[PDB]
Scaffold this active site. Structure first.
Site, short mmCIF file in Angstrom:
data_model
loop_
_atom_site.label_atom_id
_atom_site.label_comp_id
_atom_site.label_asym_id
_atom_site.label_seq_id
_atom_site.Cartn_x
_atom_site.Cartn_y
_atom_site.Cartn_z
N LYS A 103 10.17 21.63 5.38
CA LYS A 103 9.89 21.53 3.95
C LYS A 103 10.25 22.84 3.27
O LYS A 103 10.18 23.92 3.85
CB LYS A 103 8.42 21.16 3.76
CG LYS A 103 7.95 20.92 2.36
CD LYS A 103 8.57 19.82 1.66
CE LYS A 103 8.41 18.50 2.34
NZ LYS A 103 8.25 17.46 1.30
N1 LIG Z 1 10.96 12.18 -3.77
C1 LIG Z 1 10.77 11.72 -2.52
O1 LIG Z 1 11.60 11.03 -1.89
C2 LIG Z 1 9.39 11.78 -1.94
C3 LIG Z 1 9.23 11.15 -0.71
C4 LIG Z 1 7.98 11.07 -0.14
C5 LIG Z 1 6.91 11.59 -0.81
N2 LIG Z 1 7.07 12.28 -1.97
C6 LIG Z 1 5.87 12.86 -2.62
O2 LIG Z 1 5.66 12.11 -3.79
C7 LIG Z 1 4.99 12.93 -4.79
C8 LIG Z 1 5.75 12.89 -6.09
O3 LIG Z 1 7.15 13.31 -5.87
P1 LIG Z 1 8.29 12.88 -6.90
O4 LIG Z 1 9.60 12.84 -6.14
O5 LIG Z 1 7.88 11.62 -7.60
O6 LIG Z 1 8.36 14.10 -7.91
P2 LIG Z 1 8.86 14.12 -9.46
O7 LIG Z 1 9.04 15.59 -9.74
O8 LIG Z 1 10.03 13.17 -9.62
O9 LIG Z 1 7.59 13.56 -10.22
C9 LIG Z 1 6.35 14.22 -10.24
C10 LIG Z 1 5.44 13.44 -11.14
O10 LIG Z 1 4.09 13.88 -10.90
C11 LIG Z 1 3.57 14.38 -12.12
N3 LIG Z 1 2.64 15.46 -11.83
C12 LIG Z 1 2.94 16.77 -11.54
N4 LIG Z 1 1.88 17.52 -11.40
C13 LIG Z 1 0.83 16.66 -11.65
C14 LIG Z 1 -0.56 16.87 -11.66
N5 LIG Z 1 -1.10 18.04 -11.37
N6 LIG Z 1 -1.36 15.82 -11.94
C15 LIG Z 1 -0.78 14.65 -12.23
N7 LIG Z 1 0.51 14.33 -12.25
C16 LIG Z 1 1.27 15.40 -11.96
C17 LIG Z 1 4.76 14.76 -12.98
O11 LIG Z 1 4.43 14.89 -14.36
C18 LIG Z 1 5.67 13.58 -12.65
O12 LIG Z 1 5.29 12.31 -13.20
C19 LIG Z 1 4.86 14.32 -4.14
O13 LIG Z 1 3.70 14.47 -3.29
C20 LIG Z 1 6.03 14.30 -3.15
O14 LIG Z 1 5.93 15.19 -2.04
C21 LIG Z 1 8.30 12.32 -2.60
O1 LIG Z 2 14.06 12.36 2.28
C1 LIG Z 2 13.73 13.39 2.88
O2 LIG Z 2 14.27 13.79 3.91
C2 LIG Z 2 12.58 14.20 2.33
C3 LIG Z 2 11.50 13.40 1.64
C4 LIG Z 2 10.19 14.13 1.76
O3 LIG Z 2 10.22 15.36 1.73
C5 LIG Z 2 9.06 13.51 1.92
O4 LIG Z 2 9.06 12.52 2.65
O5 LIG Z 2 8.05 13.92 1.36
#
Ligand SMILES: NC(=O)c1ccc[n+]([C@@H]2O[C@H](COP(=O)([O-])OP(=O)(O)OC[C@H]3O[C@@H](n4cnc5c(N)ncnc54)[C@H](O)[C@@H]3O)[C@@H](O)[C@H]2O)c1
Ligand SMILES: O=C(O)CCC(=O)C(=O)O
Ligand SMILES: NC(=O)c1ccc[n+]([C@@H]2O[C@H](COP(=O)([O-])OP(=O)(O)OC[C@H]3O[C@@H](n4cnc5c(N)ncnc54)[C@H](O)[C@@H]3O)[C@@H](O)[C@H]2O)c1
Ligand SMILES: NC(=O)c1ccc[n+]([C@@H]2O[C@H](COP(=O)([O-])OP(=O)(O)OC[C@H]3O[C@@H](n4cnc5c(N)ncnc54)[C@H](O)[C@@H]3O)[C@@H](O)[C@H]2O)c1
Ligand SMILES: NC(=O)c1ccc[n+]([C@@H]2O[C@H](COP(=O)([O-])OP(=O)(O)OC[C@H]3O[C@@H](n4cnc5c(N)ncnc54)[C@H](O)[C@@H]3O)[C@@H](O)[C@H]2O)c1
Ligand SMILES: O=C(O)CCC(=O)C(=O)O
Ligand SMILES: O=C(O)CCC(=O)C(=O)O
Ligand SMILES: O=C(O)CCC(=O)C(=O)O
EC number: 1.4.1.4
Lengths: 414, 414, 414, 414
Positions: A103
């Site tokens: 990460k």
């Molecule tokens: N993008 C990926 O493929 C992926 C994969 C697995 C898990 N995740 C996890 O999903 C979560 C969101 O990632 P994302 O890709 O949607 O990011 P993003 O930057 O596209 O969206 C983040 C969202 O969360 C909101 N947010 C930020 N801080 C906040 C807070 N303190 N309280 C409430 N809302 C808040 C933002 O305003 C926005 O709507 C994170 O934990 C990330 O690690 C993402």
């Molecule tokens: O797609 C990836 O390899 C990363 C996604 C990720 O960081 C996550 O699963 O939270």
């Protein structure tokens, strides 16, 4: 530097005890193999020199090269990035991907930088760590505040540095630079798919189920969209600007247009505006943290009203909250299964790249959904047959940690 | 994890202010370029698995590849290693060496490991960081609890990994493995040479001077030997076990034989056994801290009885101590000058390796002594004309920081 | 496949026992670390395809990268190449060079190939082993039937493959391709220097001393020329075509003219023509084997008539011969000392390349000659105090082996 | 040093003459391109240092990178390893795999080492040859006394040295470290498949056919298990401890239980105990050598009682044996076909790794079985039209050699 590491280490300790692992083995798994911290300075539009710190945590590579996204945010810390890398180890293991956990994060407010600044930031991050990146070493991806555009910059800088047009070094790439269309929405497709399957198995079904989603970006928007298509009622959404509750249902596409024009879903006109805190403890059938970690803790876990939590975010519950949900009879579908749409989509992108691009986007979508559903069915079946007294996270972690440990033993590392 | 970093950062802000550098420039300088943390696990023959954390801080490379040693110690922290790497940047700049600053450490008690356990440790440390080491990248060396034997293990592992017999990737090597005989005693030769010169300049000469040295390892022993040979009387030595005072003079070779046969110089028969705290405040002409940082602080600095303090250790006096010495008219020769015989000797080793091994040992001795006298004289003369209201430390750091900044400006980094 | 390996291993166990080494330690030293065998096929000028086998023996690298020449000859075997690489280890150790022992050879009659065929052979030899060559890995050089022209081809192939103009990957190079003039004749200069010094120590001096040299190539010719200039009488020379004796003295330059115009010194008009066997047992004061190994053995050692043998060749005396010469009071100056002018000249060439070419031809001559005389004088004085019950070869080997063992112990390898 | 190389070279000149190849062409094919010999020293649990010799023979790379397994055994020699690498070339050519022929071995009794000693051995073996290994250079695998655990150590050492997580550098890996389940039993599945197909073609089918297998390891056990399931009667099994005959049939799973609890199948209670020699000449329908080479020779070939020999082992019949079996009307299915399930399974594993892990275990099984049957059917039909005056081995070799020669001609090498 962040409580998430304390939480993720505690969750590991609990499964290690259940597996009968020795204390010292747990210690090895609790600590990352390699962490890089790097200084990035940029000259801003105003002419001012600004310095930012970032990390890349390479937690565990028993099962393959490190894999995981990179987040930009003003509260990012070293221990947060380490903790997130540990969740990636377990997720990748659970889904039987040939990947360890990695990460990255930069401590910056990206909303306060120009596009040119963000590009320069992104390039320099890759430049400073690149000796420990590669398509068979450590493959980054998006996370909070990064996106396919970030990945195009990352890739272009890597090509500049190494001379190698190696598409596979980054995932979440634009589809015209070796990405796959499905990866854009594969996390939320996976959360929706799993939420629906979970709801059918555990609360009477998804249709008309009332759903509250915290966060409305890449994960939260697509989760809402697909769940809406599946016949759930989205009654709550939020972002950093706050939330909105409407028991009549939220128009998901309209909500995105509100974010586009105003910067926050909180400006959605028809609904009760709420704090994020209130949103999490409001009445619903299913609650989907899709924003940040540690949003449900020992304080608000007792007040959550959902029957079913599906974790779209990484690490949204503290270790205490886990115990409280278990004591309360609230079913939690863990991050490492529920959100694995992202990394499973990246796997297909990465394998397609290595294969020279011969997987179609329609095959790719099928490959992702099938693996997710198969993983859920495996988890459910191990739960029923071997660990019926344990919550689902505990069972998923038992599978995940067992596989990692086996691979380290085979390699002489334990 | 340490105040040593807080102290180094604070000194840098004061020096930057003195040089008229803006806040933004100082911010860049105060943050390391890259830091790696690595996990090392070892299985003893007892069968127990133990896990150790180590670090390599690569502070600044404006002037050349990173250069600095590696300490083993149960209280070593991330911040201690970063802080010591900043001291290396300035001393390297001050001595006009083509090197930037680096340092490493592992959090271990090396006295509780077997030789084979220490070897396993040392090999694994090098393996886990090697993609950011090299003879034109980052050149490690010894420090506390490491030595030529440690450097032989480092080298052998590096050969294993790279296939290359690149002698220059480590300094402090055994003579039979690309080392140079003078490097063993270069630090202490430099400390003695500087102490004699300062004694000649300020307190009426070195002959008959009563000297107390804290620590009796690589720096402390050789300092004691050379000052003995130069006419000085060593009335006090010490080590982790405690110290010994004898107003009639310590026999320096006998004392090492006591360490060798008993484990600590405190077992020397002919003298008063004392604690380290007591040794530091005992009556003498010259006091030479040659063990660890922050041994003289606001609490004992008023009690120190020396006319002249020569810093063999890195960072032995706090800023409060510097202030009190200034007020008391006690002369302090800073570490970045006084102890630089180690890194200058390492330069000679590294240059000898690169040039194919031609430089003789005698010429080596000359190159080291000359550079260090010249640096002291330059600094002494410079101080009469500019920064006369500052101590020697501040002037030395001012010149060191100025050179670094100038190189970063040229490289478009600032 | 060569009696030379049996001699070497046997000589090695004797030295080990005198050093008090475990049998198990000697087992390690008696076996090369790596040996490569390669196939080379060539389409000849007649149109016929021919296949040749060649080898690279990398015996020991404890003290540095492998170092030693490549020989072409129709009787060359794997075990001869291994044995010669062991001799390299001991001579490089003895002379305190930062090099281990390597050797090559190809089983071919180079006298029956065209120049273009020899080029093709040479290029293919380097190509097939290059991943285990390098200026800090294994640096080849000439030997029998190889020469600066061979080295130029080797180099050009190495540049072709690697794209680096690394002059230090081969020694014995032409002076316009990073070689040094003195290396052409440094072996013979060393042999002559050592023969004169021994003649002064033991037989009243060189002037008028009757010399017989077997071999008249790179070593043989220059030995003869320099001994002539020093005032010795060269009464016998030979090559593979036979020998010539003239008790009035041989005109050395004229003999080389005869070789160039007829192909053998045996065609020298003014002298008695002899077999090589007869040459070796002819009356003389100094006998200098300078062709091949195992030329003096249990059969002719009783009949040698010299006071002093100086080994230009590698391994010219067998172990039985050493015993007989000891019993007969014939002083033998061993190859590992007497012939080290080649590899010491190689060292200067290699260091000069690494340095950027600083060192002049005149400084270079001095450095070689001084190291040789110093080494002989060290060995002589040492021998009075220790191992006085053993011959000079044995004491040289004792030192050489002891240094290697110490370096291996330091590296954890033993 | 092994009669196996003499058999191979001799068989090769015969095929060359049938193909109408120049003697000079055959000389090229009969010699390996590269052979490495390495020394491995290990400090044992008793405290004793032991030295072991090992080899890597890279025979031919005309059709691709070298491919073949590594064997541990106290009688292993350089020429055995070379000979086995030639067999690899011909089998890889025959099966139309993009691979050349390689093989390794170490001269050691692995049954007298601890696990930790075998790990150290395995790691050092890979370290000493790694510059001529790689997923597109030379891909090792198991053989006698090596297994997926060995492969895991090899891999972990290769990752340590190179820093790349390149799964395709070894095959036979554990399935959690980029292996595939089918590779464990692909050799035996292939042998059984081929034995049934030949039994159908030539002796009326497999059902009730009396089988005798020599060896009961990776090849032997799985051959037995699959032939049992196919309806054959396993009447004889053996291992290095001796054999057991039961005309009523052996319970194959029970026999493996006996091996695990006693160390030899010779301890199987219900049957007549026999020497290996007696086993091979016992009455049966199908005889399957599945242990070592040269077990059927001019002495026992007249006394073999089988209708059909299927070569699981490499090189079990000598050339004299082939002649006798031909005269006796005994059909021999040569190793290069019958046993190719191993290397064809390796191919799928290697391609799967390169692809990113797409291929499932069930697709993989199908691909292996189909390639084998297709290859047998191609060879059968071919043999009717061409080389009908030669046995099956000879026609397979003819095709295999012809393809290699064509690829070398294309590359300008011949
Ligand atoms: N993008 C990926 O493929 C992926 C994969 C697995 C898990 N995740 C996890 O999903 C979560 C969101 O990632 P994302 O890709 O949607 O990011 P993003 O930057 O596209 O969206 C983040 C969202 O969360 C909101 N947010 C930020 N801080 C906040 C807070 N303190 N309280 C409430 N809302 C808040 C933002 O305003 C926005 O709507 C994170 O934990 C990330 O690690 C993402
Ligand atoms: O797609 C990836 O390899 C990363 C996604 C990720 O960081 C996550 O699963 O939270
Ligand atoms: N080795 C070099 O070339 C070099 C160069 C410049 C500066 N230094 C600095 O000099 C100091 C000594 O290093 P060294 O190389 O001599 O180390 P060393 O390990 O060779 O010797 C350390 C000595 O200090 C003693 N010691 C350890 N902990 C102590 C404590 N808490 N109180 C009192 N004594 C203690 C040890 O017992 C021993 O006598 C360190 O600050 C090191 O960073 C070393
Ligand atoms: N060239 C060097 O720098 C060097 C250094 C140290 C030792 N050596 C050793 O010196 C010896 C000679 O090497 P060189 O470089 O002079 O070789 P070269 O090829 O230059 O000359 C070899 C000479 O020996 C003669 N010769 C060959 N085989 C013979 C035989 N069976 N009987 C008699 N004479 C024979 C040849 O005719 C020729 O005169 C070898 O043992 C070599 O390993 C060479
Ligand atoms: N493993 C593969 O994928 C593979 C593929 C093709 C061919 N082969 C060949 O098959 C044969 C067996 O290989 P394996 O992988 O099954 O080995 P293994 O180490 O798994 O088993 C070897 C078996 O042979 C027995 N054995 C050993 N020496 C013997 C002897 N002198 N006489 C009788 N029995 C003896 C052992 O006791 C054991 O039962 C070898 O010739 C090997 O090269 C193996
Ligand atoms: O010689 C070196 O490079 C290390 C010296 C050092 O670390 C120091 O001066 O404290
Ligand atoms: O100069 C060299 O490196 C080779 C010399 C040599 O092989 C020898 O001393 O015999
Ligand atoms: O699977 C491999 O690559 C090795 C198989 C082998 O060595 C063999 O076929 O005998």
């Amino acid at each position: 530097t962040s409580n998430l590491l304390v939480q993720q280490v505690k969750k590991l300790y609990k499964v290690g005890e259940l597996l009968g692992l020795d204390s010292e083995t747990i210690d090895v798994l609790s600590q990352p193999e390699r962490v890089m911290q790097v200084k990035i300075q940029i000259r801003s539009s105003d002419g001012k020199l600004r310095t930012f710190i970032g990390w890349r945590s390479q937690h565990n590579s028993a099962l393959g090269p490190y894999k995981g996204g990179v987040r930009y945010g003003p509260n990012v810390t070293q221990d947060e990035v380490i903790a997130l890398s540990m969740i990636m180890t377990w997720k990748n293991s659970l889904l039987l991907l040939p990947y360890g956990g990695g990460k990255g994060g930069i401590r910056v407010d990206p909303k306060k930088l120009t596009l040119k600044e963000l590009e320069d930031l992104s390039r320099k991050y890759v430049q400073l760590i690149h000796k420990y990146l590669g398509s068979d070493v450590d493959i980054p991806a998006p996370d909070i505040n990064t996106n396919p555009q970030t990945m195009a910059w990352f890739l272009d800088e890597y090509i500049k540095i190494t001379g190698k047009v190696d598409f596979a070094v980054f995932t979440g790439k634009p589809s015209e630079l070796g990405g796959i269309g499905v990866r854009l929405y594969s996390t939320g497709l996976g959360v929706a798919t799993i939420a629906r399957d979970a709801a059918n198995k555990f609360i009477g079904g998804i249709e008309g189920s009332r759903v509250i989603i915290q966060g409305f970006g890449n994960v939260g928007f697509f989760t809402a969209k697909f769940l809406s298509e599946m016949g759930a009622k989205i009654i709550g959404v939020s972002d950093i600007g706050g939330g909105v509750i409407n028991e009549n249902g939220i128009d998901v596409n309209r909500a995105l247009e509100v974010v586009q024009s105003t910067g926050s879903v909180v400006n959605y006109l028809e609904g009760k505006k709420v704090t994020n805190e209130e949103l999490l403890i409001s009445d619903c059938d299913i609650l989907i943290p899709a924003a940040v970690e540690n949003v449900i803790n020992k304080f608000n876990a007792p007040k959550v009203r959902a029957k079913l939590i599906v974790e779209g975010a990484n690490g949204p519950l503290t270790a205490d909250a886990d115990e409280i949900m278990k004591q309360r009879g609230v079913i939690v579908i863990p991050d490492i299964l529920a959100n694995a749409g992202g990394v499973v989509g990246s796997y297909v992108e990465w394998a397609n790249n290595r294969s020279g691009g011969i997987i179609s986007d329609e095959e790719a979508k099928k490959l992702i959904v099938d693996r997710m559903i198969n993983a859920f069915n495996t988890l459910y079946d191990f739960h029923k047959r071997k660990f019926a007294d344990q919550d689902l996270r505990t069972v998923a972690m038992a599978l995940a940690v067992d596989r990692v440990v086996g691979a380290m033993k085979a390699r002489g590392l334990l």
